[PDB]
């Protein structure tokens, strides 16, 4: 993923307080904002008092401020307050176009997308449109993230995918090819390869009518209320429109016939916002239609699957035949080295094996998890979970493919006596924020955390 | 030829088709998912007759694969035998199978079934008057016992006579099925011929052996006693060779060094007959003889140990025999003694022969002997599923149905063996060996990368775990000076190249009994063949050993028994290999082979603590190249 609010945060404060207007806008921020922070805009949104920093100390409990920090710097990334230093404390006040657009948001208000939505005859109900957009979004998965064929409506995906850096393949030769990009992207679940590729259709299309608070404020108003009536033609700015019209023939947008009708209610927006259940000529089988295969013995053994979930499964385990309910391939240190040659580091597998491909190992699983948050104190012998030989396997293939192992973060100094070094060190192994750490050359590289907190207190 | 290929047709009818195959019907409503495009059983765990379905696919095919969740299946040709002896129904095996296993029974796996069930290990064969007739058990067999060229036209029109099925039983049809049905006496000639029109019809027949009917054979002097171990494989062998009344003959491949010759010998009491025993080679005639045979109840002065070299009494024993192929027909006859005992063993009719490890004998002198000796039954317990000895006359057919397989799985688990946890050792490289690699590649540098002290100290790290926690440590190389210069720097006694054998056995005297001592350093002289030792921590150093029938004759071999529970893994095995060196591939044949064998795999290249083991002699870079110029003088 390209974690966008780390993205949105690099964005000017004048274009974020432009989101902020659209009340609908602020509560679909709401929902992305850190549960602790999600809390305190709740109570600086109701009461706008200024109250210093040192009673919010009071409100909350012991250790657990590490969500504070955060969401106090991520409050000040994303500029949705202004930190005003009137008595040496923080007099932290929520934005004003934040701290008005939740008002009406929240006591049931006209934000643009939330009262933009039309109520009329919804022809197109929980599979009306969807399925098309699966469709349109599964011809887009073909052709950008790379399958059998591409039959993607959305030929603006197709270009984004390439100079956007969408598609993993020859760009300008018009292929979308699986690289470092597109297995980033396909390695996320569901917002990693839909906010990866969302964000080239922005970056592209940002400057000649693309408007992008207005495409934004859209895309904002798309899950700020049910387009229904006149939702697709009508909660569309010029960018959005645009942008909609653009999403209806390139399967972003459900809207109607014609590529000017109402909004259809697709789950494909539903999905990016709500992040929920991501199951959708005329057949839809769910949710377990889908599956993957995973095997103590190396070997997998398939028997629900998909047409374009085995092209994922087959770049990185050797593909040889489909039968009617079983796909040929054997999972060994060789068949993870298929996508690592071509340099995918093989994290984002682990983590797409326990997420999606799942549906067929339910069963397996079945057997791991064991209800292992009760009993954990009683017994510490875990059921295989989660799953270490698979990971020894993939860790030993991994490091072959690179033989060298690099970490990130920042090295620091002014380490002038021994005492600073040592007291950090030891709470960072409380913490584990520490990768190494040395009193005899008094520097280490991490992340700037260990360093935060302590200039905080410093400071605070 | 006597031997026909449906003994073996194992390793095929494993494929199948997606727009050509078949979706299961009963894939709505059905447990399993039993294919047979693939061959195999997918039995989920919604199966409401799960175990069934494993008892009936086990008795009849092979279970290809061992997942917790789903299972497959293997291809299993001698199934149709083995299933049809088991008692599964011809239309029974597929009407439970296709409605359990969510694959539809197909035409092929139906008739299969269906024919495996029935045909397929359900021949007929009468008898009369405690003899051999021309019938069948039942009413297709009378059709097929008249229907023989041997069993019909080689028959006389009389229905039975005491005489002639006490004494002549198209010859004594010993190897036939249950008698006291419909039939009639035959002639006395050629049994050859007899079993060579059955294979070529391909018809696996129950057989049984009289031997209380045959006037012709006197009882032997055999000392009864079953005073000899039994174990939960060595029972069953007996039980399904035996099966109800009569015994008979067949393939039952046994772990070699388990007392695999112990269900014959047992086998040998109850059939009171002549019985010989066979073994790979004259040396392991009175090597293990003198391992296990002395607590069994066979007689060694009577069971003379053929050699061919030292000479003992023969055509003159009036009991069993114990003896190799190497005597009874091979380049290696020392002198006219093994062919003297082949003209007395067509001249004596002998009923039974113990094979010990046919496959490392070439078959062709297995019929040969055959024909001229005469004999009635034999007995082939061999230990490899793959072997050379598949010739046009296959041994299964040559000899009878087998009863039971040489499930590992079963003894390697269940205590003996239990918990196999086995590993190959990537020993971190260095300048030399990557200078040994580029240089040359030929097999002379086989020893060039064993020699690595990081190997050595890999294996003093399961040297200290595994006498701390009381195990057994068992090291392999083929190398006699390199290994010897092994032990010598741990300080401790240590199996080598030409030990003398007092002092080695003095050497498993501390090993198995005393806990102070526990590496042992087998070399190539531990087979074929020595005292296989209990295994509880097995290290191999040499790792081309040809060939892969050996490997899986040394994996079976070494990892022996072991009477101990302590450890959660009782039973460690570790393959000490030099990594970005020449046994890259050879290591990693292993590493399949393990995991295709059916053990529990992982791999060990971290050490507790490793650069901080005790006698780090060589352990730098610079030492090592050293080791690895002397190591060229081998």
Redesign the interface.
């Known amino acids: 993923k390209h974690s966008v609010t780390q993205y949105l945060e690099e964005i000017p404060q004048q274009v974020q307080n432009r989101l902020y207007t659209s009340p609908a806008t602020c509560l679909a921020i709401y929902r992305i904002l850190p549960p602790l922070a999600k809390f305190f805009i709740m109570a600086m949104v109701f009461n706008e008092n200024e109250v210093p920093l040192l009673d919010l100390d009071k409100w909350v409990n012991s250790n657990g401020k590490l969500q504070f920090q955060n969401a106090i710097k991520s409050m000040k990334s994303l500029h949705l307050l202004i930190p005003n230093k009137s008595s040496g404390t923080l007099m932290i006040n929520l934005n004003p176009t934040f701290k008005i657009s939740l008002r009406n948001a929240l006591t049931g208000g006209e934000v643009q997308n939330s009262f933009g939505v039309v109520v009329e005859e919804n022809v197109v109900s929980l599979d009306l449109l969807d399925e098309y957009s699966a469709n349109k979004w599964e011809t887009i998965l073909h052709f950008m993230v790379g399958t059998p064929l591409a039959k993607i409506p959305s030929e603006k995906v197709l270009n984004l995918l390439k100079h956007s850096k969408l598609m993993e393949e020859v760009n300008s030769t018009g292929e979308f090819k699986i690289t470092n990009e597109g297995f980033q992207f396909l390695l996320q679940e569901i917002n990693s390869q839909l906010w990866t590729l969302l964000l080239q259709y922005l970056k592209m299309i940002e400057t000649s009518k693309m408007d992008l608070v207005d495409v934004l404020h859209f895309i904002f108003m798309l899950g700020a209320l049910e387009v229904g009536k006149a939702y697709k033609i009508d909660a569309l700015s010029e960018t959005q429109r645009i942008m909609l019209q653009d999403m209806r023939d390139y399967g972003l947008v459900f809207q109607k016939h014609s590529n000017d009708s109402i909004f259809y209610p697709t789950k494909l927006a539903l999905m990016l916002t709500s992040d929920t259940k991501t199951i959708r000529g005329l057949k839809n089988q769910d949710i377990p239609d889908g599956s993957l295969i995973v095997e103590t013995n190396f070997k997998i053994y398939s028997y629900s699957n998909s047409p374009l979930q085995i092209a994922v499964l087959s770049l990185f385990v050797h593909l040889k035949a489909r039968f009617v309910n079983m796909v040929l391939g054997q999972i060994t240190r060789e068949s993870i080295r298929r996508a690592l040659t071509n340099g995918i580091t093989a994290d984002q597998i682990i983590a797409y094996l326990e997420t999606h491909a799942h549906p067929q190992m339910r069963r397996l699983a079945e057997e791991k998890l064991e209800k292992k948050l009760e009993l954990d104190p009683n017994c510490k012998e875990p059921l295989q979970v989660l799953p270490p030989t698979v990971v020894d396997q993939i860790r030993l293939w991994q490091l072959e493919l690179d033989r060298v192992i690099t970490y990130e973060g920042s090295l620091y100094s002014d380490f002038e006596t021994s005492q600073e070094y040592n007291l950090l060190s030891k709470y960072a192994q409380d913490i584990g924020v520490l990768l190494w750490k040395d009193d005899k050359k008094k520097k280490f590289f991490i992340s700037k955390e260990g360093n935060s907190q302590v200039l905080d207190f410093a400071k605070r | 030829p006597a031997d026909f290929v449906p003994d073996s047709v194992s390793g095929m009818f494993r494929s ?3 727009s050509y ?4 019907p009963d ?1 709505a409503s059905r447990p399993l ?1 039993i ?1 047979p ?2 061959g195999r059983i ?1 039995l ?2 919604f199966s409401p007759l799960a175990e069934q379905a494993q008892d009936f696919l086990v008795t009849i095919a092979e279970p290809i ?6 299972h ?1 299946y293997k291809i299993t040709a001698y199934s149709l035998y083995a299933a049809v002896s088991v008692g599964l129904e011809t239309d029974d095996i597929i009407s439970v199978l296709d409605r359990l296993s969510k694959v539809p029974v197909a035409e092929s796996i139906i008739n299969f079934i269906k024919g495996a069930t029935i045909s397929y290990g359900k021949v007929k064969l009468v008898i009369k008057h405690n003899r051999y007739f021309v019938e069948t058990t039942q009413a297709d067999i009378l059709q097929m016992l008249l229907n023989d060229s041997v069993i019909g036209p080689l028959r006389i029109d009389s229905d039975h006579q005491v005489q002639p099925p006490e004494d002549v039983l198209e010859r004594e049809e010993e190897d036939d099925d249950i008698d006291a049905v419909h039939s009639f006496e035959i002639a006395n000639e050629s049994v050859e011929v007899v079993k060579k029109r059955c294979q070529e019809i391909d018809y696996p027949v129950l057989e049984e052996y009289d031997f209380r009917n045959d006037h012709r054979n006197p009882d032997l002097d055999i000392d009864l006693k079953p005073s000899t171990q039994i174990r939960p494989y060595q029972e069953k062998s007996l039980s399904k060779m035996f099966g109800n009344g009569r015994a008979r003959s067949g393939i039952i491949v046994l772990p070699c060094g388990a007392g695999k010759t112990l269900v014959g010998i047992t086998a040998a009491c109850t059939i009171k007959k002549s019985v010989i025993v066979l073994c790979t080679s004259s040396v392991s005639v009175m090597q293990w003889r003198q391992q296990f045979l002395q607590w069994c109840t066979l007689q060694p002065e009577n069971c003379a140990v053929f050699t061919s070299d030292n000479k003992e009494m023969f055509q003159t024993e009036s009991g069993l025999v114990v003896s190799t192929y190497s005597m009874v027909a091979n380049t290696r006859n020392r002198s006219h003694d093994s062919q003297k005992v082949m003209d007395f063993l067509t001249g004596r009719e002998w009923g039974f022969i113990i094979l010990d490890e046919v496959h490392v004998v070439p078959a062709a002198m297995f019929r040969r002997v055959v024909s001229t000796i005469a004999a009635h039954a034999k007995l082939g317990l061999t230990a490899t599923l793959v072997r050379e000895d598949d010739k046009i006359g296959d041994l299964n057919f040559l000899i009878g149905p087998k009863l039971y397989e040489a499930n590992w799985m079963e003894l390697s688990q269940k205590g003996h063996i239990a918990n196999v946890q086995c590993a190959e050792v990537w020993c971190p490289m260095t300048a030399e060996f990557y200078q040994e690699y580029l240089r040359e590649t030929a097999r002379k540098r086989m020893l060039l990368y064993i020699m690595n002290p990081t190997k050595f100290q890999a294996c003093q790290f399961l040297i200290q775990y595994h006498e701390r926690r009381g195990d057994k440590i068992i090291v392999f190389s083929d190398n006699v000076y390199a290994l010897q210069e092994y032990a010598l720097k741990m300080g401790k006694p240590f199996i080598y190249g030409s030990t003398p054998q007092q002092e080695r056995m003095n050497i498993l005297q501390n090993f198995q009994y005393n806990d102070q001592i526990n590496t042992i350093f087998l070399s190539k002289v531990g087979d074929t063949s020595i005292d296989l030792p209990e295994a509880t921590c097995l290290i191999q150093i040499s790792s081309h050993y040809g060939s892969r029938r050996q490997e899986a004759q040394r994996l079976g071999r070494i990892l022996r028994a072991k009477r101990r529970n302590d450890e959660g893994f009782n039973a460690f095995f570790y393959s000490l290999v030099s990594k970005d060196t020449q046994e890259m591939y050879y290591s990693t044949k292993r590493q399949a082979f393990l ?1 295709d064998q059916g053990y529990a795999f ?2 060990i ?1 971290h050490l507790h603590g490793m650069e901080n083991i005790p006698n780090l002699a060589y352990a730098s870079p610079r030492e090592r190249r050293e080791l690895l110029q002397e190591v060229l003088l081998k």
Request: charge should be neutral.
């Open positions: 199948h088709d997606f195959l078949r979706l299961r894939h998912w294919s495009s693939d997918i989920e765990s694969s061992r997942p917790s969740h789903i497959e995991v992982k791999v290249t």
